[PDB]
Design a protein around this ligand. Structure first.
Ligand code: 1PV
Ligand code: 1PV
Length: 548
């Protein structure tokens, strides 16, 4: 089965697209090498299409069925409810794509009669019709990167707004509750960054001779077959569900999740999908279950001992008991052979690691710093190149997602988020007096509206108070950061230390919540430190979800 079939009609933009870095008066203070930053556009869509279009073969053995039976047994203990129209409506993001049938995200949120009526008719159609393929729109994502001495745009596929509300009605409570029950500690979404760090370190230490590896499948969404999506549905249907929910789930699976026609922004037929849609509600849960299933079965084929898996979407890490260097390397080949038979070959072959910090997953690795007392603190960091390129773009242009804000929240303990992102953007916010203005950002693919003034509390709850006093970062983390700055022509860290004193002083001067940001976020910048005391899960990744 081919992942996609194409008609030849182009994938078209729905608005003007910028590829070149926009520049303003603030741009040079962050980043000088402007021509290294770019954004992807629909002009590279043709290139992506070629990468994501291929034949899938699948060979399923007893290890696969055994694991599947175990997953279903756990799924059978889950009781999920239908959300009402109103509940599903409130989960709809304010700036989500409008319907073709005369209403938008804000009409849905307000329970407008036109929106509510169309949702009711869409739902009724899902109950009464389990065969007719549902239309989808295919777009090129506009995303910002540094040149990798260019990436073609990713493709997003999603159905109409009315359908997206109905998905939430049928399945939101399922995708929010089921994966944790089925996968236990392996379900990565449940942890805050601080809990995840703690889980990883405790898992590494739980093995006598630890070995770990990342496995990243090439173009995972395209590797998802009709069988995979049907198997996912069979898992959902194990739950204790309302009869209405069962029918809607069967309907959505047959008509939408397994595949359907692809329409561009201008309304022309682009082709046909027989793989995972990126923009449906079940994408995150589905990829996580399917990755868990294939990898768990692949662990058994390779005879890996005392495995602990961590899975988040298509990202996978296994930590297990080492059987020896040679024995480990051999068993990974078998793992990859098993995964390939299940349709999920790797982009890069997996490498066994005997140090936790050398494992990268979701672009992140563990590193170590020290708190005020000098005790070791583990935290998750990443290469700051992409965060910094995106920050430079957002310095000059207002975007749908404020990646700088998400990056500060998710990587708050990092050397680069604290010294560069906090310092740069708080200076900008101060200059415009927009500290209290709530901004859209994404945490684990879930959309939130957050005021910068609330960052101290948000950081404390996600990382603990230690995130405001970490020092003595590792030479390797420091060198990676300093090397990235030279590469992009970002000023060196010593300049940011100077700038943070000013920004701290400016924040302290305004009193109130502003001064609290000065005290906690910038305590790293003063030599005479101020004692930091206390300041005063949800289950929806990707697939168009918002919370107040
Ligand atoms: C299976 N892999 C893991 O679960 C993770 C490992 C990992 C690293 C090394 C290792 F050996 C094992 C695991 O690191 C992680 C770091 C993140 N974060 C960054 C982050 C990455 C992507 C997104 B996204 O666009 O969806 C995002 F929102 C945040 S965060 C806030 O710091 O916790 C995450 C979050 C849940 C997605 C997962 C893992
Ligand atoms: C109030 N500020 C200070 O106390 C700090 C001084 C300092 C040194 C001399 C001086 F005269 C005045 C100040 O250097 C620091 C270094 C760091 N680190 C990050 C780091 C590393 C390299 C560079 B550098 O080459 O430019 C850098 F600027 C920062 S580290 C080694 O990992 O602990 C920190 C951590 C973030 C909190 C604080 C200070």
């Amino acid at each position: 089965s081919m992942s996609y079939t194409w008609t030849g009609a182009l994938i078209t933009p729905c608005a003007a697209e910028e590829s070149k870095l926009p520049i303003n008066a603030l741009s040079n203070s962050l980043l000088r090498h402007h021509n290294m930053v770019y954004a992807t556009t629909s002009r590279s869509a043709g290139q992506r299409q070629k990468k994501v279009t291929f034949d899938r073969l699948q060979v399923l053995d007893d290890h696969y069925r055994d694991v599947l039976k175990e997953m279903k047994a756990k799924a059978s203990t889950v009781k999920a409810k239908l959300l009402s129209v109103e509940e599903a409506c409130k989960l709809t993001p304010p700036h989500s794509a409008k319907s073709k049938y005369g209403y938008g995200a804000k009409d849905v949120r307000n329970l407008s009669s036109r929106a509510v009526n169309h949702i009711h008719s869409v739902w009724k159609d899902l109950l009464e019709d389990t065969v007719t393929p549902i239309d989808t729109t295919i777009m090129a994502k506009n995303e910002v990167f540094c040149v990798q001495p260019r990436k073609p745009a990713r493709l997003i596929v999603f159905p109409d707004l009315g359908v997206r509300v109905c998905e939430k009605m049928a399945l939101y409570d399922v995708v929010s509750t089921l994966p944790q029950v089925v996968m236990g500690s392996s379900y990565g979404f449940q942890y805050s960054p601080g809990q995840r760090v703690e889980f990883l370190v405790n898992t590494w230490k739980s093995k006598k001779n630890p070995m770990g590896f990342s496995y990243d499948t090439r173009c995972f969404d395209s590797t998802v077959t009709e069988n995979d999506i049907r198997v996912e549905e069979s898992i959902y249907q194990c739950c204790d569900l309302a009869p209405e929910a069962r029918q809607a789930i069967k309907s959505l699976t047959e008509r939408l999740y397994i595949g359907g026609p692809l329409t561009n922004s201008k309304g022309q037929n682009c082709g046909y999908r027989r793989c995972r849609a990126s923009g449906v509600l079940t994408t995150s849960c589905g990829n996580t279950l399917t990755c868990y299933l294939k990898a768990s079965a692949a662990c058994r084929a390779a005879k890996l001992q005392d495995c602990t898996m961590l899975v988040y979407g298509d990202d996978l890490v296994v930590i297990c008991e080492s059987a020896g260097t040679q024995e480990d390397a051999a068993s990974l080949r078998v793992f990859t052979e098993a995964m390939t038979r299940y349709s999920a070959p790797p982009g890069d072959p997996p490498q066994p690691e005997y140090d936790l910090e050398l494992i990268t997953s979701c672009s992140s690795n563990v590193s170590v710093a020290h708190d005020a007392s000098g005790k070791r603190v583990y935290y998750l960091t990443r290469d700051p190149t992409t965060p910094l390129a995106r920050a430079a773009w957002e310095t000059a242009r207002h975007t749908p997602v404020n990646s700088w804000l998400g990056n500060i929240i998710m990587y708050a303990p990092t050397l680069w988020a604290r010294m560069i992102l906090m310092t740069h953007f708080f200076s900008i916010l101060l200059a415009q007096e927009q500290l209290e203005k709530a901004l859209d950002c994404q945490i684990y693919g879930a959309c939130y509206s957050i005021e910068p003034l609330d960052l101290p509390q948000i950081i404390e709850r996600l990382h603990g108070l230690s995130a405001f006093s970490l020092h003595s970062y590792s030479p390797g983390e420091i060198n990676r950061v300093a090397s990235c700055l030279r590469k992009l022509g970002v000023p060196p860290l010593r300049v940011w230390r100077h700038r943070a004193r000013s920004v701290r002083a400016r924040l302290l001067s305004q009193g109130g919540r502003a001064a609290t940001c000065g005290k906690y976020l910038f305590n790293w910048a003063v030599k005479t430190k101020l004692k930091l005391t206390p300041i005063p899960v949800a289950g929806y990744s990707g697939g168009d979800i918002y919370h107040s």
